[PDB]
């Protein structure tokens with residue numbers, strides 16, 4: 001796209017790779033001849049759930065159906081066609097993941113004024129926030145449930161040759177009754193992407209060791225989930241680098257933090273944290289273990 005005639009050109013339009021009956025947006029509360037954006041006119045903005053260089057995520061109430069949702073709004077208008085294509089790919093990735101009970105559902109998406117909006121179901125707190133609120137290691141009964149549900153999500157992605165690439169507590173969202181959903185598909189890739197790459201990098205704390213050499217595969221997510229579960233089960237801050245980062249990628253489980261794990265949970269984490277991706281367990285293989293079935 002960067003050598004194509006796509007530069008220095010140019011109101012809401014639906015974003016959907018699947019295909020739609022219409023790219024026009026309508027809503028109770030929305031009049032396209034008023035100057036406010038579709039987002040401003042069509043939602044009650046209740047609170048800001050998150051913010052960063054990417055933009056902002058809001059908790060909102062839809063005027064179309066009176067229900068609660070999350071809406072992510074990008075920070076500033078598209079830089080150009082490559083930035084636009086990268087950001088719209090997130091919608092495509094949702095549509096490639098589709099509907100699955102352990103994956104956050106995308107309700108709709110649109111662009112207006114160079115800004116991209118993604119509207120998802122509203123979940124409970126992120127696993128990161130839940131652990132902050134708990135203020136301690138999570139009880140293992142909770143951990144097993146979150147591990148199972150996130151593995152079910154990964155098995156769904158991986159069977160279709162998709163790699164999430166940023167599995168971490170901030171991208172897992174609690175539901176009722178001890179369940180959770182994997183979200184945030186902004187870094188997701190379809191392997192053999194025609195060809196291989198380009199790729200953006202996930203949080204270094206959770207990154208699989210083989211990614212340092214550019215070896216991208218579904219195994220990477222199993223490793224990242226392994227460290228996610230180690231962190232929440234042990235209330236253990238993960239290093240971004242240095243000796244400790246290396247050690248966690250050489251089979252080390254720090255005794256001061258991990259001695260209180262059940263033997264069963266420790267065993268499963270060792271399988272997930274295997275440094276060699278060719279030896280690391282798959283999500284399907286982990287879900288077949290009896291400890292993960294009940």
Ligand SMILES: COc1cc2c(Nc3cc(Cl)c(OC)c(Cl)c3)c(C#N)cnc2cc1OCCCN1CCN(C)CC1
Nearest residue numbers: 049050057070071072104118120121122123124125183184
């Ligand atoms: C950070 O909080 C939440 C983020 C959520 C979230 N992220 C997200 C990511 C991305 Cl990449 C998106 O773009 C596709 C979009 Cl649109 C949303 C999705 C999703 N997906 C769904 N549901 C969420 C719910 C949240 O918090 C609910 C509890 C709030 N409560 C906790 C107690 N505290 C004192 C007050 C705040």
